Design a protein around this ligand. Structure first.
Ligand SMILES: NCc1cccc(OC[C@@H]2CN(c3cccc(C#Cc4cccnc4Cl)c3)C(=O)O2)c1
Length: 242
């Protein structure tokens, strides 16, 4: 997370950390709890190549990475079948936990948006994670969960931005309809936040608008952060999640 601050302990009870086996179980992506047994994340965190489930664990909301881990194994990794690269799209995946977790005020699910919600510029939205705090700058110990409020940019304006300083013809769409843009040169997600949630408060309820997906670096001019647009994948999600 670039900009913003440490999250208060009561916030973002759905945030999870994805861990890969090594000298220690290291954080490499975010996710969100959408059902007591299911985690939503980015396909690029776990694909397109099939990896060994044994080498993956999920950590539910904690204030600091690593201190008091309770790591959870995964029974299934379901990756959207359209996925092969983040720039193309369908950058979305589901992890089924081996057990359903218990929920409380401290750890619970996020609400998914209705098919119709567009998330227009000016909506209050936050992205959260334990990712880089600037380009090639990791989150320092003790690894607090960070949050930042990010401004939504309409897709067409984001797409135009992405064409500035680029050779790509204006009619070749880079920022696609199944994607969403947010952030600026002071506020953004970054490497290590991938797969985590962008949430917007709508009529008093937090809805997950986006999954952290890609962008050119972090907080760079004319290069807002790009998120998988959750509304586009609701039917797919509901094929697996009760
Ligand atoms: N700040 C959000 C965020 C969050 C999490 C991970 C993030 O990046 C992870 C990786 C790094 N990377 C990347 C690296 C270098 C250059 C480019 C570009 C471009 C471009 C420019 C103009 C027109 N067309 C195009 Cl395709 C893309 C990317 O795409 O994914 C970003």
């Amino acid at each position: 997370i670039v900009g913003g601050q440490e999250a208060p302990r009561s916030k973002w009870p759905w945030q999870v950390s994805l861990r890969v086996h090594g000298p220690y179980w290291m954080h490499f992506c975010g996710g969100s709890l959408i059902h007591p047994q299911w985690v939503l994340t980015a396909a690029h965190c776990v694909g397109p190549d099939v990896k060994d489930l044994a080498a993956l664990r999920v950590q539910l909301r904690e204030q600091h990475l690593y201190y008091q881990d309770q790591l959870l194994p995964v029974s299934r990794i379901i990756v959207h079948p359209q996925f092969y690269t983040a720039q193309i799209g369908a950058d979305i995946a589901l992890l089924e936990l081996e057990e359903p977790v218990k929920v409380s005020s401290h750890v619970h699910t996020v609400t998914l948006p209705p098919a119709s919600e567009t998330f227009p510029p000016g909506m209050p939205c936050w992205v959260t994670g334990w990712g880089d705090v600037d380009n090639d700058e990791r989150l320092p110990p003790p690894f607090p969960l960070k949050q930042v409020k990010v401004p939504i940019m309409e897709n067409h304006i984001c797409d135009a931005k992405y064409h500035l300083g680029a050779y790509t013809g204006d009619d070749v769409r880079i920022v696609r309809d199944d994607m969403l843009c947010a952030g600026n040169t002071r506020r953004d997600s970054c490497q290590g936040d991938s797969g985590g949630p962008l949430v917007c408060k709508v009529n008093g309820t937090w809805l997950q608008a986006g999954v952290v997906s890609w962008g050119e670096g972090c907080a760079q001019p004319n290069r807002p952060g790009i998120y998988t647009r959750v509304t586009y994948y609701l039917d797919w999600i509901h094929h697996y999640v009760p």
